[PDB]
Design a protein around this ligand. Structure first.
Ligand code: ADP
Ligand code: ADP
Ligand code: 31L
Ligand code: MG
Ligand code: MG
Lengths: 386, 383
């Protein structure tokens, strides 16, 4: 038994899900495309059409959901939205969600970028949760994309939802609240379900308390060291400590394998032809022996060490010698003994994974100690300024 | 085996139909809605995207279909357009068809309004025909509407064997007005073409040969529809009316509109001398339309009641119209017998009189062309 309320339309029996404060989402229609229609009480939730229009008038971003149209029933409010296949919950939780075929880390790239698109428009979500990060229906060749939804709306008379509210929002808003929320959903995605804060009932209590677990992030694993390093700052209690929408996009956490490798190359080149006394080099061996595992030479595979023994001239007590060795080996890769190629290669995936496997703090240490050269013409693909 | 050439997508197994000169149309996708994608060879047809872009940058007309986006394969050209239910063909010829939902004259109306909107944009369809008028899939509350398609593209002679205005063989909107005339007949006739069967169609059109066999002269609606289509399929390009002129024609009027015309005219003609040029023009056709004496060509209750006042000449058009208007006005206080024969207003009533004087509206219309500029007669007449 269908309803109209013209310019939008739906059937009430096809209900998708109930939201906060008595709002309901069904599967309706529009032109003829399948749509999710969100039906809202105007006294509870407050749509702000101005922001949404600004979204429309500006260049369409691929990871920020589009609102079809808005009309005000007497006692209600009606929104027609691209029917998505699921929310982030189905993704990380159901596990059966046949991707396809996107990685969680690109998922977070998408999300953070879309969010950044919002923040460029000086627009803040106020309620970033796994339910407000939706997944498209499969596209042409079957690929899936992630968009943020439920933006530009709020509550009259605290916004957001229990569990995903920043600390400072609960003590008598800018982008930072969205960056905190985003850190949480990052952990929720990476950690296959666990919340950093950590159980449902205690979650927000610990948010104000400052309790974090993060126990999924070992210290002997590269990717975990990176993830931890970023999320640590995203969910920092001090809102001034939280990284901006773009800043997060620029993190090593997002880099491709090739990008990490190239990072190691570039770094090795730029540190070469400068004195050991210089600021950069001295700083690069600041953490020193720690990351290298004392001497890097014995901590690597056999053939590689036979070649290196044949050539070095490589202290091993230095990270810089390691970097330089990696750059040399990457460069001269093709003209190397086939066994060496077998252990190292292929470039760049297996190559760089071969070193970050064995030195989990290498990329991190290099990246941080090389912040000095952040302004140089080469490193703007790597670092942020303002 | 899905095809991409993004952003469009289709299965070459779900073909909807072959087109002209190799082009074909399949049921494809876009965002996530079903669409129809027709592929063309860019070596045959030349798209003018300035026109379609101009369509986009102008007001959305409910009867002009929309081409979603245009893009080029290396070897092909792809157009994705709103997926429709059928063409005029299935509308007319498929005996078990759901309109649902829409009358044929409302169909033609829609078609002509979309057509007029196109013409307003200084774009000429160049190829009007049934396949190029389409039926939409049911909407919100089920209602089907009709949209015109395949406009804005041409061939590297435009048109189609059967519907091509003769002077294009020996272009302006007049061509579309002519093709439109053809489709008007085609629709109203429930299957027939004026010119009139397939192979001779274009021979007979260069000839000037018309059929119009299904339009009698004893049925009012026939006389009107004919009166228009004739002017639409006139072999002289400057004779055919403009796309809006076609719309303003009595053919499209509602019954309320018709009876309102009759009353307005009857109020106007009155208090003007009988030698007067307007009234004299009105009685030029005279007897023939009035059937000698209109008193004798109505029901017996009405005439036995018209006896009591007349005053009603009966050979005269003005007097019939004025009797209509007077009996209309004083309807409340008429005997139940007379009320009953006339039937409820305006439907049964204006039909009561149009039944018996099929030429009456056509005649009064043409005769009242005299006062076309008047501020009361503008809802009826062209400018
Ligand atoms: N755009 C959408 N498309 C499809 N399903 C949706 C959409 N938005 C929400 N849903 C589903 O409907 C439910 C209600 O969502 P919503 O009204 O946004 O409140 P909340 O933000 O608390 O989930 C959600 O759990 C989600 O699973
Ligand atoms: N939007 C549409 N929806 C469904 N079918 C269509 C559509 N457009 C065209 N067709 C089908 O494609 C066939 C021919 O394609 P086209 O070149 O557009 O028409 P024609 O060749 O008759 O001018 C028609 O007979 C019609 O059935
Ligand atoms: C790993 C590594 C490799 C070289 C090196 C490799 C290959 C060449 N050539 C030039 C002559 O032979 C053909 C290819 C030269 C040098 C050098 C170093 O550094 C000593 C090194 O670490
Ligand atoms: Mg939501
Ligand atoms: Mg067609």
């Amino acid at each position: 038994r269908m309803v109209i309320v013209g310019k939008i339309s739906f059937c009430p029996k096809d209900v998708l899900g109930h939201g906060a404060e008595g709002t309901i989402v069904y599967k309706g229609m529009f032109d003829n495309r399948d749509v999710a229609v969100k039906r809202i009480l105007p006294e509870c939730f407050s749509f702000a059409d101005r922001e949404v229009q600004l979204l429309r008038e500006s260049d369409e971003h691929p990871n920020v959901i589009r609102y079809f149209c808005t009309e005000k029933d007497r006692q209600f409010q009606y929104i027609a939205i691209e029917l998505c296949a699921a929310t982030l919950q189905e993704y990380v939780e159901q596990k059966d969600f046949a991707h396809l075929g996107l990685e969680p880390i690109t998922l977070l790239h998408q999300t953070t970028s879309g969010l950044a698109h919002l923040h460029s428009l000086n627009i803040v979500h106020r309620d970033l949760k796994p339910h407000n990060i939706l997944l498209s229906m499969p596209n042409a060749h079957g690929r899936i994309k992630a968009m943020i939804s439920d933006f530009g709306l709020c509550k009259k008379l605290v916004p957001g939802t229990e569990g995903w509210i920043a600390p400072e929002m609960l003590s008598e808003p800018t982008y930072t609240v969205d960056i905190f929320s985003a850190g949480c959903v990052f952990y929720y995605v990476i950690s296959e379900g666990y919340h950093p804060f950590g159980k449902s009932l205690q979650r927000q209590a610990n948010i104000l308390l400052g309790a974090c677990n993060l126990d999924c992030f070992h210290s002997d694993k590269h990717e975990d060291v990176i993830a931890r390093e970023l999320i640590e700052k995203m969910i920092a209690m001090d809102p001034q400590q939280r990284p901006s929408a773009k800043h997060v996009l620029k993190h090593p956490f997002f880099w491709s394998l090739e990008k990490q490798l190239q990072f190691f190359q570039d770094v090795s080149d730029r540190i070469e032809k400068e004195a050991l006394d210089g600021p950069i080099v001295r700083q690069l061996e600041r953490g020193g022996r720690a990351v290298v595992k004392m001497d890097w030479r014995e901590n690597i595979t056999v053939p590689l060490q036979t070649d290196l023994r044949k050539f070095r001239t490589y202290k091993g007590g230095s990270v810089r010698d390691l970097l330089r060795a990696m750059r040399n080996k990457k460069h001269h890769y093709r003209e190397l003994p086939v066994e060496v190629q077998e252990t190292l290669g292929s470039i760049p995936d297996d190559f760089v994974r071969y070193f970050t496997s064995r030195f989990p703090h290498l990329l991190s240490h290099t990246y941080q100690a090389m912040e000095l050269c952040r302004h140089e013409r080469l490193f703007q693909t790597y670092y942020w300024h303002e």
